[PDB]
């Protein structure tokens, strides 16, 4: 949240419009209350960058190469998989219970049905996504290392 300002003399219109560039911001209610377009006017802020600035900003988040190929302790990986599958078991029980509903439910009541109560379908989808990502990544990294390192 940033803005640039300049004042208006005691005069007419403060500025001349030779394009649409000025009228693209929809000045905020707070600024209008506190004196925008009456005691001062705004100026558009632009963030022109040079090539080196762009490259450095992009490179900021780049990680070391070894981190990419590094594997992950197999004991911890198996423990995490086991924990998530055990959770998915109870989530499947609850999902079976929930599917039996949704027919004995008012069209409006369904929306407020999931307020303060767990959503087995959503949690199952999230767990499936996390498990798939982790296992696929680990298997692919293992194979890649198997070939690269002799």
């Amino acid at each position: 949240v940033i803005d640039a300002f300049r004042l208006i003399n005691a005069n007419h219109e403060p500025r001349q419009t030779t394009s649409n560039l000025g009228h693209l911001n929809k000045p905020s209610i707070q600024a209008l209350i506190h004196g925008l377009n009456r005691h001062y006017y705004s100026i558009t802020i632009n963030y022109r960058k040079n090539e080196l600035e762009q490259k450095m900003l992009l490179n900021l988040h780049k990680k070391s190469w070894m981190e990419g190929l590094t594997l992950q302790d197999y004991s911890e990986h198996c423990k995490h998989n086991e924990s998530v599958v055990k959770e998915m078991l109870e989530l499947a029980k609850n999902y079976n219970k929930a599917v039996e509903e949704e027919d004995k439910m008012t069209p409006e009541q369904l929306a407020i049905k999931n307020v303060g109560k767990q959503d087995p379908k959503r949690h199952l989808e999230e767990h499936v996504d996390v498990l798939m990502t982790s296992n696929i990544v680990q298997c692919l990294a293992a194979m890649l290392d198997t070939v690269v390192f002799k």
Binding site: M132, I136, C139, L140, M143, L144, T146, V147
Partner: protein, 50 residues
């Protein structure tokens, strides 16, 4: 004559080893390129917009 026709080693008299070992294939090489391709296909199907 039939022993000669077949590929029988003709060891001791009336003693022809059949080499039922079949080379006993024990060498294993961890097929890695194909497994990597399979997992990458899994990822492609998971990510692509159907």
């Amino acid at each position: 004559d039939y022993a000669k026709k077949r590929g029988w080693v003709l060891g001791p008299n009336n003693y022809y080893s059949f080499a039922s070992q079949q080379q006993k294939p024990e060498d294993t090489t961890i097929p890695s390129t194909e497994l990597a391709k399979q997992v990458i296909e899994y990822a492609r199907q998971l990510e692509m917009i159907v």
